[PDB]
Structure formats: structure tokens, C-alpha cells
Design a protein around this ligand. Structure first.
Ligand SMILES: *NS(=O)(=O)OC[C@@H]1C[C@@H](n2ccc3c(N[C@H]4CCc5ccccc54)ncnc32)C[C@@H]1O
Ligand SMILES: [Cl-]
Ligand SMILES: [Cl-]
Ligand SMILES: [Cl-]
Ligand SMILES: [Cl-]
Ligand SMILES: [Cl-]
Ligand SMILES: [Cl-]
Ligand SMILES: [Cl-]
Ligand SMILES: [Cl-]
Lengths: 1007, 76
């Protein structure tokens, strides 16, 4: 009995892919050939996303070197078959997805039972071509992928006829219309952009005067400017009067793919990095050359670091170019150095590259199953050669790179033994142990990072594991729910690589200002670098500040559905995260919320705030008033809204319910207030047909004339408003629900409500209602104070406040907000939204999926190699930007840190500072600056408070000049410096040797 | 001449520009079309992020070149 989706597990993925896409995924059987690193990584991501079945084929024996990137293998599995040994561990990732083993692929006919077949590095080109031909001609979707050291590729072939249902996954563009001219020119209301492109399609509703333009018909968009687009003539439909909302529609696109055989000699490229576009053709030849080589050398790849074999590869590539001068184009030479490196690295198995292709290919599998997002069409090549260290520090030759009979051998194959040991003796702080965190720790387990006697890993995360996390936090199991993320993740990766036994310090502390006693000078100074795995901006800003202060590199990343990004912050080199602004969260105007909504986002906001006030704030206020003897005197002199707070207490204590029946009543009376009386009030001030000073109708554009609601228990939203309201109210007052063991019953509520006197509405003639945020706002408080009961008549009466939890479906919260928003939506003729959508907005949920998370984490660990080598050439580093939907990959050299000058002295405006050893006297500080820096201190301050200025008269200088900085702060702030504090940042202004104010670094005082 | 700006959501904006135009200027034109303040714009082309006060010519931006308008994301 399937055709439905587990929202509690798939919640966040569901907001990326959508329900239709996932229903198609749940009918698709996927087959993966080869279960080395690449295969298991692809499989993991696909199994997490939830397809109908996963089948894995790898009859090869496990060897120690396979552990380089195959996180589900162990030394105990050596000799046994990769497929058999991996199966059970993939199964544990998602109990809804059976994971099977194909024993044998002697019969290609067995492919017919699968909808998508994926061929990894274990499958020869000869067999990839046979298998592709079978798949292509039978309607089976085919994807292949290969990693070879720091290089990699992927190939996609979805057959002759594949339909893309949604090219991007973006919210359809929508907007309000003020005019439609006869030639089809649609002008937007006020200064709202349509945000469409030429060749988008749109449908309309509410356009008065053009009847059938609203019937669902699509119109092709010709963009005229930011504020208008044209749809072709509309004089046939009538003449525009007023109103109208347009809605973008994604139309289906049929596309065709070519076989692998055709694409080998005539490929279509998607580029991984436009800085390296010339390399795509070269590598296309190079990866074919590796297969030709293997055919010549009994299935062996070139030898690690070996010139003889590399020259053979260059000959092989040159024969493909001389034979067909059309993959490289006329008169274009083979890049012999590039091919040389491909030979040198061909046996390499690099965690970050595997992670990149694993995320990518897994998402391409999902596209293949669903028609969601734009497929990769058809070949992409990739390299991260910038990750190679300087050979002067870590030389690469046949000796340094040889296997040492360890799990790291095919990492050593690329970087050398010495480099690998420096990775193991690194000391790192990982801030977060969720999606990025889990992927990060897996990658570090695979690197052996922190495994050496000089190294360690500290990971901290202050959350416990919730169910929806399991969809992309692959180290957590259903039975780990409720435990702490960091602790569980640390244990999990130690099973993956026991070299990290006792090397990970899993902490549960919140990073920030309240934990600096723990994460202190000594803690930070000890680290080599810091990596963020965070879910919010303020935390990133905080870690950034501290990285600057302690001069530590920072590896930053982030995701939002299929979109992602990486950033590197290098001491003394680059700008920091804080250096650049991101687009802020747009705020809704207050009048729009309070009186004139037109989008469900507005009704949800309003309903969420109503929820806070009804079931959280009014309770906290009652509890404060009963427990703080000075509350009323406090509130009167430190609240903007005084009257609100006092009515909230008066109301809270005079209506006290005695049973659930009273809670139901209260809720039904609130329905009348909010959706009936308040609306009739707003219409009393502004009638349907009201006009403004120009004589144009008041209700037009963003203003939708409301109708009052007539309560109707059969209406879902009216019902649930009352159910959820009553159940929450009961929770506040400690009353047991009739609901707390089972479903709400319509007839039960109906028989309470049917017997109620609902008081009729009378208007207030003096209520002003604010029409704009520009426009102003417009004794009885001594009466309100007199009305409040003495707290001694309510001894030990607590109200229990509600604490918004969006991910518990039994708690009525999303039930309330959804119903309350929708009742308001009914009022204003806005399309009602369901629970999943209301939860997304009210709960501020970030869409997330494992694919993007692995890929972005992969790219971070390709930049990590560059920190290990202490790279100071900014041109070697890559900030990354992705969107797997498109698919799109772009990279950029970090921005350099801005520099300054004072006197003849160059300085870094982010990184440089004046370190003063000791609790120096003010006079000695001022002197040190003139004597040693050429600087005449002009102001000196500690945070908010001013310690010295050159304009101070002599009386004031006498008090301060002889004081140590700590006593000087004491004099001015009247605070002690706390005991725990060991550094103080002082900001200064100064004049240089000419007597001119100059910008200069900050000061750190080391106590 | 004509350049293109592709956004991270797949959108293609077309701009009328000259080789000597400042990046400041291209951002100005992008603001006119998209409404994004120049200070919130991250432009990238051929492996470089485009900096205020340099020119299109400085980054070797030809006719038909495609710039990417990219973002940082807060999820993790
Ligand atoms: N991407 S995810 O899987 O949804 O979540 C990963 C996060 C990382 C971890 N987390 C988030 C925030 C953390 C902090 N300190 C923050 C809290 C607010 C604040 C203000 C100012 C400075 C810092 C901070 N510390 C530790 N871990 C954090 C939880 C979740 O798994
Ligand atoms: Cl959908
Ligand atoms: Cl279906
Ligand atoms: Cl088993
Ligand atoms: Cl091979
Ligand atoms: Cl937030
Ligand atoms: Cl909240
Ligand atoms: Cl929960
Ligand atoms: Cl949604």
C-alpha cells in the first residue's frame, strides 16, 4: 500500500526534490557496477534519497588499498568480495530501500530489471560500451564515472527520449499586474520586478476584462524591461479593466542523448571550471588512453610516478589526436604535461575527488529517475592539480610515492609518504557535526587526518540527533536519535578507520561568547586550522573573527538544496568571511502584515506571531507578574507596548478555563474576533468601495478587500483552528485534553459550539488604522493596574508556556499556524497552503540533501591539501560555487586582503595587529607607538569606552597616564576586568609623522 | 558589445557594455536589471572574482563572454 512519502524522514529532501520526483524515485531500481570509493559514495547518496531498490555488483576481493576511499570496508574484510561486504552497511542507511547483490553479470540481459545503471572505475571501456549500448537501445538510463587521482569524469546518457519536468527547482516567479495593453504588454504594479527571462511561460488569474486569459492557458514571455513583459496580442480576449496575478509555469522539455560510442569520438562537454576549459578535450583523450593502455598491459593502469608509462600514454593520446583532429580542434597540440600527470596519478584514489563525483553522479541518478532538474549533457571532466604540494617541500618520484602496505597507499601514490604524515599530524577544529560535519569527518577518517602522534581532531556540536537528520547525516542510525551529534559521529568514523581511536575529542559545547572559558587562547593557538560545518551566519561570523584574531586558516562551506559554496580564509593572504556582505533576509512591511496581506507568507507570519502571543508570551508574562514584585513598576517604565502586556495578564487571569470545554469556547470566540469582528472593523474604516484623495479605489494592487468568515466546522481550517487553539490553551492552563490520547471528533466540538452565544459585532468609531509605515500610529492604564489580581490570591499558579517545536506532528503547533494562516487567507481571498508548506515558512526550514553536502565537502578537502603545504600563492586557492540542478560549477581565486600604509610601513588591514606583551602603563603605550611605530596616538578605546585622547586636558592625563591598561579600564568603566580574560583588543586612531590621521592596525594587550 | 550574466538559479541576463567599462559599472547595470545592490554581487569569470575599480579589459572579457553571479549559502 505505497504511493505516499514519510515526511518525518524525508522532510528536508522533500523541499528540494518535491513529492512527484520522489514518487518516481520510489519506483526506480538502480544498479551500481563497482563498489570501490566512487561506487559506495554514489550508492550511499542514492540509498539515502530513497529509490525503490539498490543493487550493487562487485565480485572483486577487498584489498587493503581499497580502504583509501571505501569507508564501508575494514581490514577484516580483506579477501572477501566488495559487493557482499558493503551490502549490509548500505542497507542500514535507509530501511525503506532494499540493497541487493548481483552475483554475476555474465548475462547483460539481467540489466533489463533496472531503470538506471551506473558504471564506475571498475568497468573497462569495452564493457562500458557494451553495457551502454544495451541500456541505450532498451530504454535504460546509463551513467558512468571514473576518478584517477586528482582527475575525474562523468558521462550521462538517458536515451533517445528523456523529458525534463523542471529545469531548476526554483519557486515559480509570480507577481501583480497593473496593466495589460492590447498588444500584450504586461506592466507590473508599482516597482515590482517580474523576474522572468525571454521564453518563460506564464498563466494568469484575476485579470478582469480578459475572461479567458485566466483559464490556465500559457503565454510565452518576451521581456521588455525589468518591469514589463509582452505576451502577444490579447485584443482577441477583451479589454483590460483591472487586477491580475501572473504565475510562471515550467513546461516540459524533450531531450535526446547519444550513446557512449558516439560521444567518445564526438563529445558534448559540460565544464567543471571555465578557467580550465581547454583541458576538457585533453582529458577526454587522456581517459580513453588509460583504457587503451590497460588493454595493452593486461588490465593494469600506468605505474605510479613512472616516466616510461607516461610517455606511452602521451603517444597513445597523440595517436587519438593525429587520427581525429576534431576532439582537440585543428592545429592544437597535445598538452603533454597534463597527460603526464594523468599517467602519474592514474592509480590514485583521492577522498575529495571521489566525494565530488559521488555527490554529482548520485544527483544525476536522481535526475534520471525523476525528470527533476536539468541533466548533465553529456561529459564532464575535472581536475584539482592545484592541490599538489610544491615538489621542493614534498618531492614526488617512484620512491616517495610507493605503497607502504597501508590503507593510504593510493593517496600516497599522489602526494608522497611525507605529505601524508603531515596530514596525520595536523591538529584541527571542526565546528559542527551535522550534514557537512558528518561528511567532513568521513573524509578525515579516510585521509588519516589527526591520526599521527602530533595530531588530533576536535569537533564540537551542541545538538542532538533528530529523525529528519538521518536523511543526510549518514553516520547516524535510527537508534542514535536523541544522542549527541558529535559524540556519535566520532565513534562512527573510528569504526571506519581505527587509526583515529582516541584521537577525536567530541565536545557538546556551543561555540560563541559564553564558551570562551573553554575555547580559550590556549585551545585556538594550538590548532593548525579550523573548518566550519555550520547552519547559520552568526556562527560563521564568530568563528571568522576568531580565526582572524588567532591567525588560523578557515575552511568555510554552505548549502541550500542543490546550491553550495566553499570559501578559504588564509592568514596574511585573503579576505575573511566577514569582509563581504550577503543579501539580507527581506522584511515584510508592518502594515502589510497587520491589515493588507496578499501572499500566504504574510498570513503565516501573522499567524506565527499570534501563536507566540496566545501560547508563549502571555504565559511568560503571567509568570513574571506572579514572581516579580516589581514587574508592574518595571513594565510601566521600560516597555514601548505597556497596555498590551497589562491586558495580556488581565485577560489571562480573568478568563481562567476550568475544563477542556472552556478551552473550546475560548478558541471559538477567538475565531470570531480574528476572522469576523476585526475584519468587519477594517471594512468599517475602509468600505469595499472606499476611495483615496485622487478618487481611485482604496482596495487595489496589494490591497485585497476581505470578507468576514462565518464559522463552519466542516471547513478544515475553521475546525483545526478551534481544535489546535483549544488544545494549546489547555496546555497553558494545565488542563487535560479530550484529544491527548486520540483524534479530535467533529460532532463533539460541534455540540459545544452549537450551544454558544457568539456576541454580535459593534464597530468602534475612533479606531485609526495605519495604511503605511510612513504615516503615524494613533489614563486607562491606572484602571488596568487596579484590575490585576494580587499574586498572593494565586499562590503557586504557573502557566506553562509553549516552546515552538515544528518537527513534532502531535503537538498542535503547525496545526494551529496552518489553520490560523489559512483562515486569514480565506478572509483575503488568498490560496490556502498545507502543513508541509506552512512548516517550511513558519519554521524557516533550509532545504537540504546529501548529494550537495558530499560534493561541497569534497571540494573543501581539496583545498585542505593546500593548507597542509602552507601555500602563499593566492592563485593556487579556489573558492567554489555550485548548483547541481543545472548542473553548474564555478571557481574563483580568493580576494586578497586589503592593505594599507602609515609612514613607510605596509600593513594588512585584516590580519596585522600590534601585540603588546604585558599590562602596560598608558604612558608607556603612547611612547612605544611614537618611538617604535612613528605614530602619535590620538584616541585609544576598549570596546565602547574611551581610555585616552590627545585632546584631554592635563588634570585628566595625570589620572590616566600612570595606570596599567586594566586599571585604566577600571577607572573609566567602573568594572573590573574579569579573572578569565587574558587578551584585550584596543582600537586606536593616530597621526603619522606628517601630523595626518592614518588608518592603522588594532592592538592586542597580552595580560 | 554584448556580455551575458548567468545567475546561480539559471537566469541569463544580457548587458550592453564596452571593454573599458569598470566592474563598478557592470554591477550598476546588473542592479538596474535585477535590483541587487553592487556590494551584494559576487561576479566570477575564468577563475577570477571581479573586483570593484578594475575594468572588463583587465579580466580579458570579450564579446559573448559569460560572467556568473554567485552566492554563499548558510545551510550545513
Ligand atoms: N547543517 S546542519 O546539519 O543542519 O547543522 C549543522 C549544525 C552545526 C551545529 N551548530 C550550529 C550552531 C552552532 C554553535 N554556535 C552558534 C549558535 C548561535 C551562535 C551565535 C554566535 C556564535 C556562534 C553561534 N556551536 C556549535 N555547534 C553549532 C548544530 C548543527 O548540527
Ligand atoms: Cl511537486
Ligand atoms: Cl508514480
Ligand atoms: Cl549480510
Ligand atoms: Cl580500468
Ligand atoms: Cl535564522
Ligand atoms: Cl522560533
Ligand atoms: Cl523533535
Ligand atoms: Cl515549498
Amino acid at each position: 500500500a505505497a504511493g505516499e512519502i514519510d515526511e518525518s524522514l524525508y522532510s528536508r529532501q522533500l523541499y528540494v526534490l518535491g513529492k512527484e520526483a520522489m514518487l518516481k524515485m520510489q519506483t526506480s531500481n538502480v544498479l551500481i557496477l563497482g563498489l570501490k570509493g566512487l561506487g559506495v559514495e554514489i550508492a550511499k547518496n542514492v540509498v539515502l534519497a530513497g529509490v525503490k531498490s539498490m543493487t550493487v555488483f562487485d565480485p572483486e576481493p577487498v584489498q587493503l588499498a581499497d580502504l583509501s576511499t571505501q569507508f564501508f570496508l575494514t581490514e577484516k574484510d580483506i579477501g572477501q568480495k566488495r559487493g557482499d561486504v558493503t551490502r549490509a552497511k548500505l542497507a542500514e542507511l535507509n530501511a525503506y530501500v532494499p540493497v541487493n547483490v548481483l552475483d554475476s553479470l555474465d548475462d547483460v540481459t539481467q540489466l533489463s530489471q533496472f531503470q538506471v545503471v551506473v558504471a564506475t572505475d571498475t568497468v573497462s571501456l569495452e564493457d562500458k560500451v557494451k553495457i551502454n549500448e544495451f541500456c541505450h537501445s532498451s530504454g535504460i538510463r546509463f551513467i558512468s564515472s571514473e576518478t584517477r587521482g586528482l582527475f575525474g569524469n562523468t558521462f550521462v546518457d538517458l536515451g533517445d527520449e528523456f523529458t525534463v519536468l523542471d529545469p531548476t527547482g526554483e519557486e515559480p516567479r509570480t507577481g501583480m499586474v497593473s496593466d495589460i495593453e492590447p498588444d500584450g504588454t504586461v506592466t507590473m504594479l508599482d516597482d515590482n520586478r517580474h523576474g522572468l527571462e525571454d521564453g518563460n511561460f506564464v498563466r494568469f488569474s484575476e485579470v478582469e476584462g480578459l475572461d479567458k486569459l485566466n483559464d490556465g492557458t500559457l503565454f510565452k514571455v518576451e521581456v521588455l524591461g525589468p518591469f514589463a513583459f509582452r505576451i502577444g496580442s490579447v485584443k482577441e480576449y477583451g479589454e483590460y479593466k483591472k487586477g491580475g496575478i501572473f504565475t510562471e509555469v515550467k513546461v516540459p522539455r524533450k531531450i535526446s542523448f547519444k550513446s557512449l560510442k558516439q560521444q567518445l569520438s564526438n563529445p558534448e562537454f559540460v565544464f567543471s571550471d571555465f578557467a580550465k576549459f581547454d583541458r576538457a578535450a585533453q582529458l577526454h583523450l587522456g581517459f580513453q588512453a588509460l583504457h587503451q593502455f590497460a588493454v595493452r598491459h593486461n588490465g593494469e593502469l600506468p605505474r605510479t610516478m613512472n616516466d616510461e608509462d607516461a610517455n606511452e600514454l602521451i603517444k597513445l593520446v597523440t595517436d587519438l589526436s593525429v587520427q581525429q583532429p576534431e576532439v582537440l580542434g585543428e592545429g592544437v597540440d597535445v598538452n603533454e604535461d597534463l597527460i603526464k600527470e594523468l599517467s602519474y596519478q592514474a592509480r590514485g584514489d583521492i577522498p575529495g575527488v571521489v566525494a565530488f563525483f559521488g555527490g554529482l553522479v548520485a544527483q544525476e541518478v536522481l535526475k534520471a529517475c525523476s525528470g527533476k532538474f536539468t541533466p548533465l549533457k553529456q561529459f564532464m571532466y575535472f581536475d584539482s592539480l592545484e592541490s599538489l604540494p610544491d615538489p621542493k617541500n614534498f618531492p614526488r618520484n617512484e620512491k616517495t610515492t610507493q605503497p607502504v602496505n597501508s590503507r593510504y597507499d593510493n593517496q600516497i601514490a599522489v602526494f608522497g609518504l611525507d605529505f601524508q604524515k603531515k596530514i596525520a599530524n595536523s591538529k584541527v577544529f571542526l565546528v559542527g557535526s551535522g550534514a557537512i560535519g558528518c561528511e567532513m569527518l568521513k573524509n578525515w577518517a579516510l585521509l588519516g587526518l589527526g591520526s599521527g602522534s602530533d595530531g588530533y581532531i576536535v569537533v564540537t556540536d551542541n545538538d542532538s540527533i533528530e529523525k529528519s537528520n538521518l536523511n543526510r547525516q549518514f553516520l547516524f542510525r535510527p537508534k542514535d536519535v536523541g544522542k549527541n551529534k558529535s559524540e556519535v559521529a566520532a565513534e562512527a568514523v573510528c569504526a571506519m578507520n581505527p587509526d583515529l581511536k582516541g584521537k577525536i575529542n567530541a565536545k557538546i559545547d556551543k561555540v560563541g561568547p559564553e564558551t570562551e572559558e573553554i575555547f580559550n587562547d590556549s585551545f585556538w593557538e594550538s590548532l593548525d586550522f579550523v573548518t566550519n560545518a555550520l547552519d547559520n551566519v552568526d556562527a560563521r561570523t564568530y568563528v571568522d573573527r576568531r580565526c582572524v584574531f588567532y591567525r588560523k586558516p578557515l575552511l568555510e562551506s554552505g548549502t541550500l538544496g542543490t546550491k553550495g559554496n566553499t570559501q578559504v580564509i588564509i592568514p596574511r593572504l585573503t579576505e575573511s568571511y566577514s569582509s563581504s556582505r550577503d543579501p539580507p533576509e527581506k522584511s515584510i512591511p508592518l502594515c502589510t502584515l497587520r491589515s493588507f496581506p496578499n501572499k500566504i507568507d504574510h498570513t503565516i507570519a501573522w499567524a506565527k506571531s499570534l501563536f507566540q502571543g496566545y501560547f508563549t508570551d502571555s504565559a511568560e508574562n503571567v509568570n513574571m507578574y506572579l514572581t516579580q514584585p516589581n514587574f508592574v513598576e518595571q513594565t510601566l517604565k521600560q516597555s514601548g507596548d505597556v497596555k498590551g502586556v497589562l491586558e495580556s495578564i488581565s485577560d489571562s487571569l480573568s478568563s481562567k478555563p476550568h475544563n477542556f470545554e472552556d478551552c473550546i469556547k475560548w478558541a471559538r470566540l477567538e475565531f470570531e474576533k480574528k476572522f469576523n469582528h476585526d475584519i468587519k472593523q477594517l471594512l468599517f474604516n475602509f468600505p469595499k468601495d472606499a476611495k483615496t484623495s485622487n478618487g481611485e479605489p482604496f482596495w487595489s494592487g496589494a490591497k485585497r478587500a476581505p470578507t468576514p468568515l462565518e464559522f463552519d466546522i466542516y471547513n478544515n481550517d475553521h475546525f483545526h483552528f478551534v481544535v489546535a487553539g483549544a488544545s494549546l490553551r489547555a496546555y497553558n492552563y494545565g488542563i487535560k485534553s479530550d484529544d491527548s490520547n486520540s483524534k479530535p471528533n467533529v460532532d463533539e466540538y460541534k455540540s459545544v459550539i452549537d450551544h454558544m452565544i457568539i456576541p454580535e459585532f459593534t464597530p468602534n468609531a475612533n479606531l485609526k488604522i495605519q495604511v503605511n509605515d510612513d504615516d503615524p500610529d494613533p489614563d486607562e492604564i491606572d484602571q488596568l493596574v487596579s484590575s490585576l489580581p494580587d499574586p498572593s490570591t494565586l499562590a503557586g499558579f504557573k502557566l506553562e508556556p509553549v516552546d515552538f517545536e515544528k518537527d513534532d506532528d502531535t503537538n498542535h503547533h503547525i496545526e494551529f499556524i496552518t489553520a490560523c494562516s489559512n483562515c486569514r487567507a480565506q478572509n483575503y481571498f488568498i490560496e490556502t497552503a498545507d502543513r508541509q508548506k506552512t512548516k517550511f515558512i513558519a519554521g524557516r526550514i533550509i532545504p537540504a540533501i546529501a548529494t550537495t553536502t558530499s560534493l561541497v565537502t569534497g571540494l573543501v578537502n581539496l583545498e585542505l591539501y593546500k593548507l597542509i603545504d602552507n601555500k602563499t600563492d593566492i592563485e593556487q586557492y579556489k573558492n567554489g560555487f555550485v548548483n547541481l540542478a543545472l548542473p553548474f560549477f564555478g571557481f574563483s581565486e580568493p580576494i586578497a586582503s586589503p592593505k594599507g600604509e602609515y609612514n613607510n610601513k605596509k600593513y594588512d588591514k585584516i590580519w596585522d595587529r600590534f601585540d603588546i606583551k604585558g599590562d602596560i602603563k598608558l604612558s608607556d603605550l603612547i611612547e612605544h607607538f611614537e618611538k617604535d611605530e612613528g605614530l602619535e596616538i590620538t584616541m585609544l578605546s576598549y570596546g565602547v569606552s574611551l581610555l585616552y585622547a590627545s585632546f584631554f586636558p592635563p588634570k585628566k592625563l595625570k589620572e590616566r597616564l600612570n595606570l596599567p591598561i586594566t586599571q585604566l579600564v577600571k577607572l573609566v568603566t567602573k568594572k573590573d576586568i574579569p579573572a578569565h580574560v587574558s587578551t584585550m583588543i584596543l582600537e586606536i586612531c593616530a597621526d603619522d609623522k606628517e601630523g595626518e590621521d592614518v588608518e592603522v592596525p588594532f592592538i592586542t594587550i597580552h595580560l | 558589445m554584448q556580455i551575458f550574466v548567468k545567475t546561480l538559479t539559471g537566469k541569463t541576463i544580457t548587458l550592453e557594455v564596452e571593454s573599458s567599462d569598470t566592474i563598478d559599472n557592470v554591477k550598476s547595470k546588473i542592479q538596474d536589471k535585477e535590483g541587487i545592490p553592487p556590494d551584494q554581487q559576487r561576479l566570477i569569470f575564468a577563475g577570477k572574482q571581479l573586483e570593484d575599480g578594475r575594468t572588463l579589459s583587465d579580466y580579458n572579457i570579450q564579446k559573448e563572454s559569460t560572467l556568473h553571479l554567485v552566492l554563499r549559502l548558510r545551510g550545513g
